Design a protein around this ligand. Structure first.
Ligand code: 377
Ligand code: 377
Ligand code: 377
Ligand code: 377
Ligand code: 377
Ligand code: 377
Lengths: 307, 307, 307, 307, 307
């Protein structure tokens, strides 16, 4: 079984697509293995770039296809190169930009943790033909973090394995296991942008909603919460157009719902305060002073939803 | 008449385009048939990957083209492999990402059931030349529905059938029946996002809109439903920028129509109250107390849409 | 002059681009013509799919280029096939997805009728070298209009003709008339979404706008109309995001202008009623009670605009 | 010095990209010149389409690359044809779709004049090797401007010229002047949509804004002007959502500023009228009667911008 | 150790993607080196364009791969040309369009400085095989700045340097230093559009927001701030849709934040004015008349944040 040692050089992980559960990786693949010795010009190793690799492949050089298992679509490949050594060994070297796929839970956006994954597995040779001897991953990364959207935690965690397929070809003995390289990079979303620009004003809006109770008349109280209502809606629209599209609510969505809830609840209180009476216009001296009651009741429920 | 057995491996179904009635599928086709026996190197099956498959084809390897009927555009193809066994049999193996077309009725959005379909048919060989002998489809599926946009339901439907074409070339005898593979994968929409961030708050606005009748004055009543009206427009737009583009109204779209509708009737009821009089400002104590009438009048007419 | 019979199978018409005056057609071209007898294996017709076709051309098979005249950019091609008959004939068979160009008037959107057109014409052989003997077009059609954006109406129209070019090569006598196929498909827009979701509420807004004259006070009357004005802009904004970019107004675009007018009209009337006085509030004791005047005076300007 | 005559057929100029200063051109290029005499089948001119052209090149057919200087990216090419006449002459014919670049000032949008440009210059041969002998451009354009985004005006400006490059090899004699073909086609924007749906309603907003002064009270005067303000903003968003992206202001932009300009001046005045006093409520009965004063001042400042 | 001279001709820098930290460059690479003498037709240099360059490479011509280290995806290449001189020297010539990557801090948008960078480094040859001898960059730009999005300011920076890779393949002796060309171009953003259309009206919004204190009553003061609140929100959304998506805040973002705060600050000030009393309605003469106070209190907090 030919031992292929692999190297991934990750140049950029960027472009996350939340709806698609997809992220873009720019980098190099390096694959190395040893064949039967060759005679090269001089006796210094031989270089074969791009186009000529196919010419070499035609006259019979084994360059096994290594497919990116979790790539969506087939990757943009840049220069390719062969280094042929006389002692037999072969080095395949190529640049790639691919859009990769992984399960991505975004429900605690903008406080989500994600993991970028690469899965590599030979397209046609099983573990008895081609086996992954090792893999190094160079994440040429560090520092300058707050300008950066995602905070990389690790330094590329790795797992080589054997994948067994129960449903394949006309194959019986044990030729149904392929070797797989799985590369993981752990990350955390930098939530500041959402804290200052989405969370904060959404809060100031919700906060001032409560100031409806500092209004003198009932006509004033009831008529204003309609504006307040229009404002939360105005805010949702501002929000939605900019934030990632998901098939679920985020923490920010729920704050909006809660704002809708708060204002619609005050509507009930404002209306109820008025018509529950011992005459007709008995505004409950005590209930009308829930100006401090349910800002902190919202503050209590604010903590209860987080548990 | 050659028996061709096929396997589809579905990796990801994603990117539904509502306006286009379209969705993306990543996966593998495996097609197999038996030829006249070959003398292969050693005696184990010969592997041929990508660039070299053409070379075998140029020298007369029969590799029949199996086209994806309902593909829009020509699919992105990944690695291809030919495996030539010595006893005659040949297996074609390839990866694809393609956009497939199928009738997609989105009218009960966000509660639609959709069906992702793949249709397979030889491009040049009819059922007397090439026949589909059987087909399994593996949906490497499980888990995390709650994380996903669509929830797949069945295990996948399969049907081999024979399609007869009545109008073609100058060929008649019986070369007009092609053998067809049809794959069906059932799905349901994840409704929850739309329930909580569209339906519910649109629902609160509708109700709180009705609180306009709890206003004491006539002037307050009428002037206020104009803000209520402006709110629904603002809401409608929020919805519009976010929801899928269609050529018909969805259940949400209708909720907005009703919202506009409730508000406009309220204008009428409120004006009717005022100027229908025995003085000038005799607001029908009873009709202004339709504070209970058309809130539950809306629920009756809302439940009439269920037939 | 080689007689070529053509067949187009129209699979999908989708992707209208109103700014570009463009649409997408998925389908197959079939071209048939007769050369000199060939020897085919057995004596049964010979099949040549995709890759092998070019190779036949290298050995001199005449496969003439038939160009899509009105295609924007060059079409995505699927599988190509040649059926070479021993009796002399050749049949060319191809799938295409193309972005096609045609004049499209959108002024009565969402009630426009459009016609999707294909224009076929040889790239290198004139009508005395190659002539279109005929052309039939199959629109595999039926059902589900209510599901679709466009309603195909006809069954497809035809035109075989001669296009005369006055300025060409160093050759003058008659290498200037090429034969052209024109395929025409009629369509109507499914107007229902824009009917219920844009027209109706836009109407209810305009309608309820007129209820300004039912307000007792002048402040009520003049200030309320400012809200109305804001509502129409909000409505304008709501719309624009969804409507197609055109360089002219549509029907909806006019209802909007009509609205701004009706509102701007009342601002003036409300100011006029009040400040044309012999005191300060000498409202033309009746004019303010034009609650029927320019609502139905507006309706009059509406039917005349349909001239 | 090979005389090459060039002919361009322009089919569609479309898809202007304002941020990029880019527009699309679909059409055919035709280049003609005479080489040394050839023996053709019979003695009738020989046609060489697509694939077969390369074959002719590999055997030494001189086919010079003529590059589109101002093309962004490389053009989409459709069919190509070589016509080889026996007397020596060669005719190259190919269809193209390209994104072309030219300086585009959009500041008087929507009343801008633009010029679509093509620049053709050999990639490898200087004016002493390959010279452009003449060039005609056919603009198969006409009719129906009212339907189209752009109004093509002229019949196309043409200039064959000599371009001198100062920095190349160790060459002294004269190898540094390349011959260039330049096509100019003038156009004007169809302003109608923006006139009717951007300028007119905008003016009415501005106009109806000045009616803030016909309000009786001060509250009304100040409080309403905030409503007016929100309106200008709402209008601004609707506009931006739709208007082309630029790095400078357009006429419309300036209008929006003016709307903001009108309102903020009005607020100042309304407060000034109120508190500039000899009492407390000496509202300047006259300055609050600047109801026609700064409508003609906005009109004066509007017409002065042309000076 | 082969000396390579390089030239970059920058035709266009355009299409910055703020989220991707990406920009587009159109231009030509010219690489020159000296090989072993050739016999060319006559003795004048031989020109070899496009398709034919591979053919020369197939026969063993060394045309080394020079990679753009920082390009995202593989560049679109136009014409390629090989110039083979008889004295030995070889000149490679090509047009390119690529999307390049580089670090871009966008935080003081729209007054940011950015730098468009090109990085070139041989794909397979280290500094002992292939060395960069010198490099020029020509930016055929000038004039018309006030029309363009970025104002290129300096000329262009160049640095030939040696990159040492400590961890590669299994090669150690000295094969780990590659020579790298680095091109730097400084640019500043055209701030004008944002100053006039975004900053300016926002100032007018914020300022006129403070005139809420010139209102006589408490109701006028409190309720009107809710209108002010809705206005700033509307301004935010209008802005959002238009400004470049970043994962962190800009100057304008903060202005919006500030604007929100200003409004929320005043709600508190206004309510406090009402309820901090020695009667019930002691509206604090200074705090009610803080009409000069936090208009200039906002200017104090505004300038220190600039420091
Ligand atoms: C057995 C195989 C066949 C092809 C599809 C699968 C999914 C399964 C991956 C693989 N590497 C290639 C191995
Ligand atoms: C007869 C055929 C020829 C080509 C077009 C059609 C539609 C009809 C499908 C097919 N599989 C391929 C079979
Ligand atoms: C002669 C031709 C040459 C090329 C351009 C024209 C417009 C005229 C169309 C055509 N099919 C191709 C035939
Ligand atoms: C001389 C040349 C060489 C190459 C680069 C330049 C810029 C200058 C354009 C050209 N067409 C191709 C001609
Ligand atoms: C307040 C709003 C209400 C709705 C219409 C306006 C025009 C004004 C734009 C907006 N995005 C949504 C915000
Ligand atoms: C040594 C190398 C090998 C390949 C990948 C790296 C990242 C490292 C860049 C390089 N130019 C090409 C040089």
């Amino acid at each position: 079984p030919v031992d292929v040692s692999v190297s991934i050089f990750i140049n950029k992980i960027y472009g996350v697509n939340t709806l698609e559960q997809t992220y873009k990786v720019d980098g190099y693949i390096v694959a190395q293995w040893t064949g039967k010795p060759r005679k090269t010009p001089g006796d210094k190793p031989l270089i074969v770039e791009n186009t000529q690799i196919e010419r070499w492949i035609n006259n019979g050089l084994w360059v096994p296809a290594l497919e990116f298992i979790n790539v969506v679509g087939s990757p943009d490949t840049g220069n390719k190169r062969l280094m042929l050594f006389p002692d037999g060994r072969v080095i395949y070297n190529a640049r790639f930009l691919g859009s990769f796929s992984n399960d991505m839970d975004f429900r605690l956006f903008p406080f989500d943790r994600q993991q970028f994954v690469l899965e590599l597995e030979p397209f046609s040779y099983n573990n008895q033909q081609l086996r992954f001897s090792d893999i190094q991953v160079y994440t040429e990364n560090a520092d300058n973090e707050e300008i950066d959207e995602w905070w990389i935690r690790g330094k590329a965690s790795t797992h080589i394995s054997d994948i067994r397929y129960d449903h394949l070809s006309s194959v019986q003995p044990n030729q149904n296991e392929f070797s797989r390289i799985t590369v993981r990079i752990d990350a955390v979303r930098n939530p500041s942008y959402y804290l200052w620009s989405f969370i904060l004003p959404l809060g100031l809006i919700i906060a001032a909603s409560w100031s409806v109770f500092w209004l003198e008349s009932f006509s004033e109280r009831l008529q204003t919460s309609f504006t307040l209502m229009l404002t939360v809606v105005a805010y949702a629209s501002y929000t939605s157009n900019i934030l990632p599209r998901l098939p679920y609510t985020t923490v920010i969505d729920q704050m909006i719902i809660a704002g809708y809830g708060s204002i619609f609840a005050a509507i009930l209180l404002i209306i109820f305060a008025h018509h529950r009476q011992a005459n007709g216009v008995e505004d409950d001296l005590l209930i009308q002073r829930c100006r401090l009651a349910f800002p902190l009741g919202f503050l209590a429920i604010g903590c209860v939803l987080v548990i």
